[PDB]
Amino acid sequence: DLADRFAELERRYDARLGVYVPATGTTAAIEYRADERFAFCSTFKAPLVAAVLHQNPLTHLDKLITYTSDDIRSISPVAQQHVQTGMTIGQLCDAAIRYSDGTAANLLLADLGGPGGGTAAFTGYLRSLGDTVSRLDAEEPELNRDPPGDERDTTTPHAIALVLQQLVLGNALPPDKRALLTDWMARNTTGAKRIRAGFPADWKVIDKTGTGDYGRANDIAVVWSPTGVPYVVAVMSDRAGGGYDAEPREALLAEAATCVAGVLALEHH
Numbered sequence: 001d002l003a004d005r006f007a008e009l010e011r012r013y014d015a016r017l018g019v020y021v022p023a024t025g026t027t028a029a030i031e032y033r034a035d036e037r038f039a040f041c042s043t044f045k046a047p048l049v050a051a052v053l054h055q056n057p058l059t060h061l062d063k064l065i066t067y068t069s070d071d072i073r074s075i076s077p078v079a080q081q082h083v084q085t086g087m088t089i090g091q092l093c094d095a096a097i098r099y100s101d102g103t104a105a106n107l108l109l110a111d112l113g114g115p116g117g118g119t120a121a122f123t124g125y126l127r128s129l130g131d132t133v134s135r136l137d138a139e140e141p142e143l144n145r146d147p148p149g150d151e152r153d154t155t156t157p158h159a160i161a162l163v164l165q166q167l168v169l170g171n172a173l174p175p176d177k178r179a180l181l182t183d184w185m186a187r188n189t190t191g192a193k194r195i196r197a198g199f200p201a202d203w204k205v206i207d208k209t210g211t212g213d214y215g216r217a218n219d220i221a222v223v224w225s226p227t228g229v230p231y232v233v234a235v236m237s238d239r240a241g242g243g244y245d246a247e248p249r250e251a252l253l254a255e256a257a258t259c260v261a262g263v264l265a266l267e268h269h
């Protein structure tokens with residue numbers, strides 16, 4: 001019946017919708033097109049920050065990276081502000097997560113794998129985490145621009161949640177480093193209208209959004225019940241019918257998250 005609720009969202013928003021919530025002790029897994037591929041968009045910036053965190057000591061976050069206005073080829077609200085003084089690796093992670101800064105993400109890719117191998121290196125951190133399905137093939141902004149049906153720069157709701165689960169609720173990062181990722185996602189500025197909107201205020205939410213062409217809108221989150229019970233939420237969508245310039249629908253994601261919140265919070269004693 002929840003599948004039918006999701007189907008209606010799709011009909012109404014003229015859109016394809018992907019949802020995954022892993023099973024916990026107390027709940028079943030929520031799945032709707034969980035193994036269909038969806039463009040990553042900026043959602044990759046979360047596991048990217050984990051990858052830089054993991055490969056280096058915390059000292060590495062103080063490394064000043066300089067770049068130029070030449071390097072800014074995508075929306076970079078923080079990297080623009082710091083073009084002349086440079087940004088540190090920590091600042092970059094800050095911007096990548098909290099502002100979805102494209103330049104910031106492209107520098108972390110270079111830090112991770114050098115020039116020319118950052119995508120390979122990021123995909124390999126996911127492989128190290130037992131995700132064989134996901135893949136990153138390009139930098140910003142081109143990763144946001146592949147056609148529907150192209151496997152390049154795709155993940156699936158299933159895969160990316162299971163990765164986020166490991167990153168936030170598992171040991172893929174130690175506590176000093178995991179906390180920093182969580183603090184950055186917790187302080188996200190781009191996600192108020194997606195998973196966050198679908199959940200009561202006394203549930204805690206950390207998240208990383210995505211947005212892109214063909215009406216792509218993503219959100220991945222980790223949510224906490226008022227009594228600290230955690231869940232992973234992956235919600236992904238596109239709207240290929242409108243062409244490359246089609247309107248993405250944040251409302252579609254908030255509705256989905258509301259269905260999920262509905263399930264996870266109603267207690268049936």
Ligand SMILES: *C(=O)/C=C\N[C@@H](C(=O)O)[C@](C)(Cn1ccnn1)[SH](=O)=O
Nearest residue numbers: 041042074075100141144210211212
């Ligand atoms: C961020 O999560 C993923 C994509 N961001 C896009 C967006 O914010 O809509 C762009 C990178 C925006 N853009 C236009 C020109 N340069 N950047 S994507 O639409 O290209």
